[PDB]
Recover the amino acids of this structure.
């Protein structure tokens, strides 16, 4: 089958640079145009740049002109995006794509995060106050995404809601995980949220009372 | 850009032999697709083949082939082992993809497959 | 630079429904319009191109039409796998541009949120900051209003909220709102309240605590 596989995404400081690569297979590479599309977190699709099969027709979105360079190596079945002078709003998933009529093949994307924040594990605080009660954990001030939250080591899944993180003005993320349980359970059962943040090698168990 | 041409206007071949049309298209860029069509009885156009091919259509009819000639302008569009039922009306079309997408068809030609 | 405007921004429908979504170009794009489906965490997939041509392997219930500046995508009979976000794109001229998207969500009966307020922990306060959390659990539709009041003073730019995607089981939403104060400011006040307005409630509900 046609396959497109991106690599090179990561964390960069504002002003820095990053090179994305894409390996293509399952078609004669030089006969098809290629493109980069991006999607900022929680946002829509944005075309970045396009290069024809032979590489002589090259186009850029105004938002990246002068900073990004697209290129291809037809002997290596490869597509590249050199991103210089990166800005915070370049934070996005970047998809390597190929087009024909519309964009018929998409890679699964590589994530780029442009931020001055440094890697930092979360502080985990309890959330504690009818037949139903709520409890939670506030997972505050971590970078970068993601964190994973479970409850009672995975024994408690029904009624759990772990919310999408919000980015704070500090540049750190924050989220909450909550669960509703029978009110009568609040004095008999123990409730522990387990928070994992691999970028910082952090694992936290927090008893909530 | 000018529409492609499609020649000869009348092609006569014998059943079992090959029939070759030429679609000619002056490309100002690499960003074109060339399509080969037959006209149906209801004057619906049916795509026979394309160059570059549609990668989402693997496993096509090998009887309809497109060959790029070395000058990069001319393309052979060939019916291999023509059948009497291949007699009809044929054309080619060019579709630009970038910087502006648009479709232009050639004049139509007739294929006559004899006994 | 052609602008593509999609509508509606979201639509609730049931399995079996006929649904039609709209895309409007800020200038003529002839028929060079494509449509894509995207599900959370996955790349988009192509559905339609040249306004009305169904892409290979796309189910027959998907169709598209339109020309000039007005385009539509129609799903003739919605199936469970069809709930997703849809994007149109013009492939007429560089720069290629996309609509903002239409989210297709599952219709269900109105459900009032259960509302809960959480004071800051002593652990966090010891660190110099105070977060107060208001939870709206398992409501529908998505639209809700949350207002923070501290000793009656309406709060403005010191809260953030987050919403879950539709529950896989009951098709509801949940929402968190977090009000963040310095410890000193938090200790200046007594009554912390979150007032919630939602279609399923006959009146706003206020949940509050007294810092003392």
């Amino acid at each position: 089958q046609v396959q497109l596989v991106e690599s090179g995404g990561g964390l960069v400081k504002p002003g820095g640079s990053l090179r994305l690569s894409c390996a293509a297979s399952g078609f004669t590479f030089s006969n098809y145009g290629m493109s980069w599309i991006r999607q900022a977190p929680g946002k829509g699709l944005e075309w970045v740049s396009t290069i024809s099969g032979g590489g002589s027709n090259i186009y850029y979105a105004d938002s990246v002109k002068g900073r990004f360079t697209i290129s291809r190596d037809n002997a290596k079945n490869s597509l590249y995006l050199q991103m210089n002078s990166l800005r915070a709003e370049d934070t996005a998933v970047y998809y390597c794509v190929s087009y024909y009529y519309g964009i018929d093949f998409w890679g699964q994307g590589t994530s780029v995060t442009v931020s001055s924040a440094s890697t930092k594990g979360p502080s985990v605080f309890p959330l504690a106050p009818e037949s139903t009660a709520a409890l939670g954990c506030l997972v505050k001030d971590y970078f970068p995404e993601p964190v994973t939250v479970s409850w009672n080591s995975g024994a408690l899944t029904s009624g759990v809601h772990t919310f999408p993180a919000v980015l704070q003005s500090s540049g750190l993320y924050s989220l909450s995980s909550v669960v509703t349980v029978p009110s009568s359970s609040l004095g008999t059962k123990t409730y522990t949220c387990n928070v994992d943040h691999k970028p910082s090698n952090t694992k936290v168990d927090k008893r909530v009372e | 850009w000018n529409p492609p041409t499609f020649s000869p206007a009348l092609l006569v071949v014998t059943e079992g032999d090959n029939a070759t049309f030429t679609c000619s298209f002056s490309n100002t860029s690499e960003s074109f697709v060339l399509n080969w069509y037959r006209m149906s009885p209801s004057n619906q156009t049916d795509k026979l083949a394309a160059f570059p091919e549609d990668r989402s259509q693997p496993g096509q009819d090998c009887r309809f082939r497109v060959t790029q000639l070395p000058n990069g302008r001319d393309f052979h569009m060939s019916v291999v082992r023509a059948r009497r039922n291949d007699s009809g009306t044929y054309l080619c079309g060019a579709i630009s993809l970038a910087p502006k997408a648009q479709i232009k068809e050639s004049l139509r030609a007739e294929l006559r497959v004899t006994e | 630079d052609i602008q593509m405007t999609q509508s509606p921004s979201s639509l609730s429908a049931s399995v079996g429904d006929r649904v039609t979504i709209t895309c409007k170009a800020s200038q003529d794009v002839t028929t060079a319009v494509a449509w894509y489906q995207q599900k959370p965490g996955k790349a988009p997939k192509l559905l339609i191109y040249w306004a009305s041509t169904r892409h290979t392997g796309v189910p027959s219930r998907f169709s598209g039409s339109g020309s000039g500046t007005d385009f539509t995508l129609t799903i003739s009979s919605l199936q469970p796998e069809d709930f997703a976000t849809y994007y149109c794109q013009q492939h007429y001229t560089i720069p290629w541009t996309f609509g903002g998207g239409t989210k297709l969500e599952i219709k269900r009966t109105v459900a009032a949120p259960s509302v809960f307020i959480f004071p800051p922990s002593d652990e966090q306060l010891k660190s110099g900051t105070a977060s107060v959390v208001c939870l709206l659990n398992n409501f529908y539709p998505r639209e809700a209003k949350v207002q923070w009041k501290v000793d009656n003073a309406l709060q403005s730019g010191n809260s953030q909220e987050s919403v879950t995607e539709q529950d896989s089981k009951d098709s509801t939403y949940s929402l968190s709102s977090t009000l963040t104060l310095s410890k000193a400011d938090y200790e200046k006040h007594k009554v912390y309240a979150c007032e919630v307005t939602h279609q399923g409630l006959s009146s706003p509900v206020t949940k509050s605590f007294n810092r003392g």
